[PDB]
């Protein structure tokens, strides 16, 4: 194998795709392996040299891993263009109380965070639908007048979808690139790192 | 105004379940829905333990306590972007796979397993340059490259930039099925769901 990549669920919906596409077009000779998994798994596998690169969020728990700040992803209210709030670019955080949501199941870290900071903010929106797949959530949102909580970037990837900013912010996480320290990377791994970083410089 | 737990195999998530769940929700907004995609072995098991109300997978069903209602016929196609050299065709010879550089689902997936099986059976050994454990990742990769993939043609009708090329002869054809535990009485939500799923397939 030439390059094993693992990322937490959300990056699969807007980040890793465009990146691996570019990487492949540049170094077609390198075969790629991509797996979306929980940060615990990514960290574990990187320590066991079962993965070359990882993408997750701070803080990193394993001391043997190095973390390179990638980007700051903040959750937003993702809706269809026909959702009554779509007319806005930003709405009060208090708007969530009346939102009927479609959320990822507890399995996902994002959901976990949503629950934590919602209760923290005194917000208890009604979860009418739950799914264990981001795409399913997006699919349901496109066809309904419901909403979801996901990083804003995912919305820029779909026309019928729009990300509404929350004021004040519910959750903001720092995306990071993970690799095992004191471990020499292949030329592929290094070019990967570089490219990932060049993409977040815009 | 209660609940309804649904589970489907990976491929249905990318074209079937979404539109159906949205319709069901608009029709019966009081019912809270639970959707989970997983291996058929898990769906079957969970249905047996009354942990799921409805399942969607393929024939043959292994568990004898489960009932199986034929839903539709899903056949694998070569899915590519519109800028893919073969996109101009609607159907191509199965032999064209030898020259295709693919992006496929990993072994974890049943579809992948099937592909590897019938490919070998057909004497086809295409080169897999990229593997992922998510259909969306595969599709995302195909849209931005000139690579192809093997997935049920329907998936393509959900994306503009994508197109499904029919294979002649066909590589794989599976029978989609609705799963529920027999001798088990369904809720009104479960029943209405079953109905809607069938109305959508002209079944």
Swiss-Prot record, chain B:
> Which domain of life does this protein belong to?
Bacteria
| BP-aspect Gene Ontology terms | regulation of DNA-templated transcription
Gene Ontology terms for molecular function? DNA binding; DNA-binding transcription factor activity
Residues spanning the signal sequence: none
Similarity section: Belongs to the LysR transcriptional regulatory family.
**What is the documented function of this protein?**
Positively regulates the cynTSX operon, and negatively regulates its own transcription. Binds specifically to the cynR-cynTSX intergenic region.
Its name, as the record gives it, is: HTH-type transcriptional regulator CynR
Show the taxonomic lineage: Bacteria, Pseudomonadati, Pseudomonadota, Gammaproteobacteria, Enterobacterales
Q: Which residues of the complete protein does this chain represent?
A: 90 to 292 of 299
């Amino acid at each position: 194998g030439s390059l094993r990549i693992a990322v937490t669920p959300t990056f699969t919906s807007y980040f890793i795709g465009p990146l691996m596409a570019d990487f492949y077009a540049r170094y077609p000779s390198i075969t790629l392996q991509l797996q979306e998994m929980s940060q615990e798994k990514i960290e574990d596998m990187l320590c066991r040299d079962e993965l070359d690169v990882g993408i997750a969020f701070a803080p990193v728990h394993s001391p043997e891993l190095e973390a390179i700040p990638l980007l700051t992803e903040s959750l937003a209210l993702v809706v269809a263009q026909h959702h009554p709030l779509a007319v806005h670019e930003q709405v009060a955080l208090s708007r969530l109380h009346d939102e009927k949501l479609v959320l990822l199941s507890a399995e996902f870290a994002t959901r976990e965070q949503i629950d934590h900071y919602c209760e923290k903010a005194g917000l208890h929106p009604q979860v009418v639908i739950e799914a264990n797949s981001i795409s399913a959530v997006l699919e349901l949102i496109r066809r309904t007048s419901l909403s979801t909580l996901l990083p804003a970037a995912i919305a820029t990837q779909h026309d019928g979808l729009k990300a509404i900013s929350l004021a004040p912010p519910l959750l903001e996480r720092t995306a990071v690139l993970l690799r095992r320290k004191n471990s020499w990377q292949t030329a592929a791994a290094k070019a990967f790192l570089h490219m990932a970083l060049d993409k977040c410089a815009v």
